[PDB]
Design a protein around this ligand. Structure first.
Ligand code: 16L
Ligand code: 16L
Lengths: 116, 115, 116, 115
């Protein structure tokens, strides 16, 4: 998959399961168009969002719905979501892993970008 | 003030100086309206964004222009910016510090909310 | 594997490859005994450190040699290493992933603990 | 002072208060000798650890007793402590802040080194 999302829970020491993720792409008119969405698995991973054909150059936003996640575990968290915004594929196709590590009042995010 | 932003650089081990920061408040129509902005100081801090009177409950977005920061240092970064979106709630503590720790391909953010 | 180590590079947006890792276990006399060691692969991962038989209860230290890593890439880093110290297997066998995300003056570490 | 420690809590969004911190200096025989210690303040900070005269170049270890912190809050943590080991170098800036951001199964640490 050219775009994968991995989410971990820093309170539990576990994958963050059933986390909703929405991906948008910036359009020519500067609006954020819905691009793909899904939920993390029991491993904290979300694959199958897009294809190399569909995943063209652009500015992408990966919105991780952390508030909804924490509001199931009895924690009232600080953030509404964690948003990751980046230019993709502008030197040709790459594979992207967007990883996030969640706490109620904090998160960490990183990217792993590989050239197939 | 009731809102402060602190930005640190994980590559150089220092404050992130002269970083542009824009704060937006979510309007009734679900658009982001400009609220406050500035550039971080030599200590990586931006104070004076708002007052207690203006900083009412609501959803706020703090956008940190990380891409320009890295580019000015001659380093190629991943993100367009770092986004921190949160609800201000009067039931909680009264002073909010949004802190961010920057790397070219990663960032960490936390909130320190005190009375 | 009951003990895995994953290391990422926050400057490059890549796995951190060829990172030396030394694992110690606290002995009855309170000294740190060498337990296992290895290097991260091209995926940033180190598997094969131990077996479920060998990986008994104890206090373990996972030392990630971050300074040696950064001193190959032309960065003089801040830390000597990143050390992760934890009690393992004290409610029976678990599988542990120790993950670290490295920058020259900072690191993040987390654990993912699963019950097979 | 030349050495400060700041500790934050990522679960509660606040300073980590009353956390024990021990600082060690590496001796010639490769053992860790006690150097300074204290407990973080209400602002999560520990100042007054050393002076410029005593804080010579060398390898130092800052051990943060995270396990006791979490246990006092009734939360089960992963780590025994958080360790930060570094070399003090006179060629670099003169003031070192060791910051740590704590969660039960994770921590982040950074160094802010300034003049
Ligand atoms: C409210 C004051 C305040 O936070 N002061 C201060 C001084 C030094 C560091 C910091 C914040 C540090 C920080 C440190 C780490 C390791 C992080 O991952 C993040 C997101 C932030 C704050
Ligand atoms: C149980 C195996 C497992 O979690 N493997 C795995 C695979 C890929 C990434 C990771 C961890 C990523 C990560 C991501 C961030 C933002 C971090 O601050 C830290 C410390 C780690 C772990």
């Amino acid at each position: 998959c050219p775009l994968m999302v991995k989410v971990l829970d820093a309170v539990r020491g576990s994958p963050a399961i059933n986390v909703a993720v929405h991906v948008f792409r910036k359009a020519a008119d500067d609006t954020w168009e819905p691009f793909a969405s899904g939920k993390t698995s029991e491993s904290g991973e979300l694959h199958g969002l897009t294809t190399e054909e569909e995943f063209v150059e652009g500015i992408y936003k990966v919105e991780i719905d952390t508030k909804s996640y924490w509001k199931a575990l009895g924690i009232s968290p600080f953030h509404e979501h964690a948003e990751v915004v980046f230019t993709a594929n502008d030197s040709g196709p790459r594979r992207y892993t967007i990883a996030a590590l969640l706490s109620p009042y904090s998160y960490s995010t990183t990217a792993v970008v590989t050239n197939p």
